[PDB]
Amino acid sequence: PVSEKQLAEVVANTITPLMKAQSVPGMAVAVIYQGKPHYYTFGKADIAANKPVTPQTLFELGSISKTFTGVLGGDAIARGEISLDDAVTRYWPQLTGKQWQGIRMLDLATYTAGGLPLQVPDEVTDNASLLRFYQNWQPQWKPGTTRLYANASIGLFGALAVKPSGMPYEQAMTTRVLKPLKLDHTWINVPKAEEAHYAWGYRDGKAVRVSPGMLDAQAYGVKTNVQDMANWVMANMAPENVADASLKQGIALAQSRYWRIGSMYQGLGWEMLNWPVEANTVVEGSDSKVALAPLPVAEVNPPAPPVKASWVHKTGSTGGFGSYVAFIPEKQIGIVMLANTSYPNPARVEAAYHILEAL
Ligand SMILES: *P(=O)(O)CNC(=O)Cc1ccc(I)cc1
């Protein structure tokens, strides 16, 4: 294997047209091919300041942050601190509403609680209002019957999962996930010293960065560079190489199949499809019309351990960023696409599929 010059061509040929069509300012790309990460960088991080995109440029991950939440939860499970079968109420006893009765930790993690909203209401700014919000929520469906992708669901999962540890979320994440994996440039809160590397997102011509929100850290607040992200993919595609025993298992727990929703499988943060899969299947499923809709689930009990022959992926966006990650453990290939403009899901998926198709 080589084709290095061929590889650089494949990427350029796919990304070049993408940036022109969706008018993306800058993009950092990583292709993992036979245990070796390959970095590609394009455009600008900061238009005004005319700063180019570099392997050290920090991007906002949006929903890709949920894969971190998934692994942290997995690790806690693996440590014995938590169980997917546990009642939510075991961790948050204040949640006295009769409606919380049959809801488990698993439901929160996999969006099956019964219709918790996509977003935490903007009116919620503190513990009091947060508690209130959850206490008054009226489920539209019964637990374990319908999947409704929501921040308010996995957001709470993450907040609760770290209780037994005694450490606040950001601390638990750094200590148990980042440190061990040597993800030294992965932040929840970017330090002053690193700020020079923090790119500007672009929306309606305006430069923008993500704002603070309740459960932001747990659902969409991670910031990284293409370097750490590539290392994240590698750790997930080949967990046998992870030294920490609970982390190792945590990763396997996050890639396990808990529910069946047509052709896709819901993991902890991660979403999977059986490989081989047709492009249209992946692309079509990524559109908001499908991705954000309430759909019936089929339980996988016991949960199926990770399948090598899968298409593991996750899309993520912020007001001004658009990211995508995909890998096939069987083939030892992966891709990372970080952009500073939020462009349609389908286009990210199509682009990633095509490069990976050059297997
Ligand atoms: P996910 O699929 O990447 C989607 N992203 C987020 O919900 C979070 C978000 C949405 C709107 C703004 I403005 C900021 C963050």
Domain around 202: 1-359
Binding annotation for substrate? 314-316
Binding annotation? 314-316
Q: Give the residue numbers marked as catalytic.
A: 63, 149
The answer to whether 250 and 72 have CB atoms below 8 angstroms apart is yes
CATH number (domain holding residue 25): 3.40.710.10
Q: Which residue type occupies 152?
A: A
The answer to whether 191 and 131 have CB atoms below 8 angstroms apart is no
How many Å lie between the centroid of ligand 1 and the Cα of residue 317?
Answer: 5
Please report which helix (H) or strand (E) contains residue 343, including its range: none
Task: Could you list the beta-strand ranges (E) of 175-234.
Answer: 201-202, 207-208, 223-224
Q: What approach was used to elucidate this structure?
A: X-ray
Q: CA 230, CA 18: separation in Å to the nearest integer? A: 21
Q: How many CA atoms lie within 13 A of 134 on its CB side?
A: 25
Closest approach atom of ligand 1 to CA 210? 14
Q: Which residue type occupies 323?
A: S
If one residue of 68, 120, 203, 220 were mutated to test the ligand 1 pocket, choosing by the most ligand atoms within 8 A of its CB, it would be 220
How many Å lie between the centroid of ligand 1 and the Cα of residue 299?
Answer: 28
The answer to whether 43 and 26 have CB atoms below 8 angstroms apart is yes
Q: CA 329, CA 275: separation in Å to the nearest integer? A: 10
Residue (of 321, 327, 149) closest to 237 by Cα position: 327
DSSP for 254-284 reads HTSEEEEETTEEE-SS-EEEESS--HHHHHH
Q: CA 104, CA 89: separation in Å to the nearest integer? A: 8
Measured in degrees and rounded to the nearest 5, phi and psi for residue 184 equal -75, -5
Please report which helix (H) or strand (E) contains residue 49, including its range: none
Q: CA 61, CA 233: separation in Å to the nearest integer? A: 14
Pull the structure tokens for residue 27: 């993009």
Q: How far is CA 236 from the centre of its chain?
A: 12
The answer to whether 231 and 334 have CB atoms below 8 angstroms apart is no
Residue 172 neighbours by CB under 8 Å, 6+ apart: 72, 162, 165
- Using N-to-C axis directions, what is the helix angle for 66-79 and 245-254, rounded to 10°? 120
Q: How many domains, in total, are found in the chain?
A: 1
Q: What is the resolution of this structure in A?
A: 2.3
The answer to whether 298 and 340 have CB atoms below 8 angstroms apart is no
How many Å lie between the centroid of ligand 1 and the Cα of residue 72?
Answer: 21
Pull the structure tokens for residue 242: 């992870």
Q: How many CA atoms lie within 13 A of 249 on its CB side?
A: 8
